[PDB]
Paper text:
Eukaryotes and archaea partly achieve this regulation by strictly controlling the activation of hexameric minichromosome maintenance (MCM) helicase rings that unwind DNA during its replication. In eukaryotes, MCM activation critically relies on the sequential recruitment of the essential factors Cdc45 and a tetrameric GINS complex at the onset of the S-phase to generate a larger CMG complex. Archaea also use a six-membered MCM ring to unwind DNA, and archaea possess GINS and Cdc45 homologs that stimulate the activities of MCM in biochemical DNA-unwinding assays. We present the crystal structure of the tetrameric GINS complex from the archaeal organism Saccharolobus solfataricus (Sso) to reveal a core structure that is highly similar to the previously determined GINS core structures of other eukaryotes and archaea.
The structure adopts a tetrameric architecture, with two copies of GINS51 and two copies of GINS23 in an approximately twofold-symmetric complex. Each subunit has two subdomains, with a larger α-helical subdomain (A) and a smaller subdomain that contains β-strands (B), consistent with the structures of other archaeal and eukaryotic GINS protein structures. The order of the A and B subdomains is reversed between the two subunits, with the A subdomain first in SsoGINS51 and the B subdomain first in SsoGINS23. In the archaeal structures, the core consists of both complete GINS23 subunits and the two GINS51A sub­domains. The underlying subdomain structure of GINS51B, Sld5B and Psf1B is conserved, but its placement relative to the GINS tetramer core varies among the structures. In the case of SsoGINS, the two GINS51B subdomains have a unique and sizable dimeric interaction surface. Although it is not known whether an SsoCMG structure would closely match eukaryotic CMG structures, this analysis shows that the 51B subdomain would need to move a large distance from its crystal structure position to accommodate a eukaryote-like CMG structure.
Residue numbers in the entry:
A (entry chain A), B (entry chain B): 1 to 148
C (entry chain D): 1 to 174
D (entry chain C): 1 to 176
The structure:
Amino acid sequence: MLDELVKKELSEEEITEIKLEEIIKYITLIKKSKTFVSSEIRKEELKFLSELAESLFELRLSKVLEGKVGKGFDEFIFDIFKILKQFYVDLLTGRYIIYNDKIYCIVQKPLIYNDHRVNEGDVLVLPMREALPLIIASYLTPYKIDIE
Amino acid sequence: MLDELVKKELSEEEITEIKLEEIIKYITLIKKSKTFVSSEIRKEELKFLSELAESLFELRLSKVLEGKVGKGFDEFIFDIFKILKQFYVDLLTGRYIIYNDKIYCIVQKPLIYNDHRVNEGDVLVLPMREALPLIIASYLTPYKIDIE
Amino acid sequence: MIEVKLRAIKRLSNVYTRRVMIIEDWNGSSITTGNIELVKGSENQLPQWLAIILEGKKVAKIEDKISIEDLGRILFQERQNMNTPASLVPLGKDFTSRVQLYLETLRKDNNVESLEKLRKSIGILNEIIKIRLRKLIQLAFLNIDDQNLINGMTEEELLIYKTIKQLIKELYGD
Amino acid sequence: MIEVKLRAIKRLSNVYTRRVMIIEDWNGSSITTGNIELVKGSENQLPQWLAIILEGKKVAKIEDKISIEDLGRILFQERQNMNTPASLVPLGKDFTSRVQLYLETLRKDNNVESLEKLRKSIGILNEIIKIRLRKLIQLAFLNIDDQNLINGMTEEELLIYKTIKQLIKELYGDII
C-alpha cells in the first residue's frame, strides 16, 4: 500500500528499493477495487491516495537532491532529473551556443520541426523550451563547446 | 559571477526571479575569458563555477519541491519536473493501463517507433522508460482511465 | 526546510487507526480496508479518512476526540516544569492529527461559540508549542539521546529535534 | 534540504573577498575579476581562491588571517555578556573559512609550538561556539529586529538561526 511506502521512506535515510513487481501488484489492486468499492468512497479515497503518492515522489526526489543513489522501479524518472541538472550546469558554464533564447542542437534521429524534415547530423537552432524535451527524448543533443 | 545568484537564493525563502539576461551576462564572460585568461587559472575557476551552478539548481529545485512557485529563465525546466510528478501520481493511483512493464499511450504527432510510422490518434503500448521521454516531448500522451 | 516531510506526516495521519463505535449497520469496501462489514454495538478500528466519511453519514461515531480540557491540562503540566527541558508531556503520534481535526470541526460549524472557543484554543496551543519548543531545542543543543524523551515527542517535533541535532553536529564537527 | 544548503555554503566560501597585500608586481586575468594589475605596496580585494593561488606563487600575502590572539579576544568579548542574546560579536561570513585556514597551517607545520597553538585554539573555539550557540537559540525565540546581528553572524551560524526560526514558524502553521 502507499501508506507503507511513504512511512518507510520517512524512516529510512537511503532511498528504499521499491521494485516494479510491488507497483504492478498495487495497481492491479486499484483496478480490482472498482468491482466492490462504491463511487462515493472511491472518490474520497482518491484524494488521500494521490496525496500519499505525491509525497512518495517528493520524499524520494528530495533524497536524490541530497545525494542519495536512486534504485528501484522509478530509476528512469531519476535519470531524467539528472539530465535536467546536467543541462543546467552546462548552460551556466558556457558549454552551449545560445542566440537569445535559442540553442544550437545536433539532430540524433529523424525529426519534424516547423513542418520541415531534419536528419541525423544536422544542426537545428530552436528555443530551449522546445530543445530540452527533445534532448530528454534522445531526438537532439546540445552542441557542446569545450571550454577546457 | 554565479555566487551572486547562489547567495541571494540561499537567503530568500521564495524562488528568486533570475531573468535570462542575467544568465547571458555570465555566459558571455565565460566565453570572452578563453582568449586572455590563463589555462591554469581558468580550469580551477570553471570547477568552482560548475559547483556553484549545481548549487543554484539544487537550491531552486528544493524550493519547487516545497511548493514555491518558480519564475525566471528556468521555468521550462520546472515544468518538466511537474510532468514527472503528475506521471508518478497518475501511475500509482491506477489511472494508466499497464501491461507488464508497458503503458498505453495515444499518439499526438507523427512518430517513428521501432522503424514503424504511426500518426495522431493511434494507440501504442511501449515500456515506461521509453514512453515518459516521449510524453515530455509531446509525441505521446498516456491513456488515462476515466474514473467511474 | 522540512515542508516535504511535514506534508508526508500529515497525509499519513489520514490513514491512522481510530477507535469507532458503530451505531448503524453498513457494509462496503475501500482500497485500504478491502471488503468490510460493520455491525451495531461493536467497536471497530478504521482509517481516519473512512471514519470521518462514516461519521458524517451517521453510520458511526468517533470516540477518541481531543477536547479543550485536554489542551488546558497539557498546558498546565507543561508550565509546572517550564525551565526543565526533559519534562515534555508524552503526547504521541496522533496528537497533531486530533488537534487538526478539533480545529477543523470548530471552523466548520462557524458558530459564535466556535469562534471564541477557537481563539481560546489557539492561545492554549501557542503557549504549548512555545514551551515545548524551548525544551525540545534545548534537548538538541545539549545532545542528549534519551529513548523515553524521544517517544514523548510527536512526529513533527521529533523531526525538528533531529534536524537541529544533525545541523549542529555537521557544522561543528567538520 | 539542509544538505543542499551545506554544500552551497561550502562552495560560497571559495569566493569570499579577502584583503591582500601585494608584494610583487603581477598582471593577470580571471573570469571573475577580468584583467587586473597588481602593484607592490597597495592593498587590493581578491576572491579567496585567487588570493591563495597568488600566495603560493609568492605574488601576494593574505592580510586578514585569524590568529590565536583574535580567538582569545573574541572569547573575552563573548564572556562579557553571556546572558545577553543580542551581544554577539560581529564576526563575518568569512570567519569560519579563515579559522579553517589558520588551523590547517598549524597542522602543516607539525611543530611542537604549532600543535600547542592548535589544541589551545580548538579549546577556545569550543567555548566560543558554546556561548554563541546559546545566544543564537535565545535570539531565534526572542523575535527581535535582527539586521545588525545577522550581519555579525558567520555563514554557518546564520543557517542555524534561520533554520530554527523557519522550523518554529512551520510547526506553528502546521498545527494552527
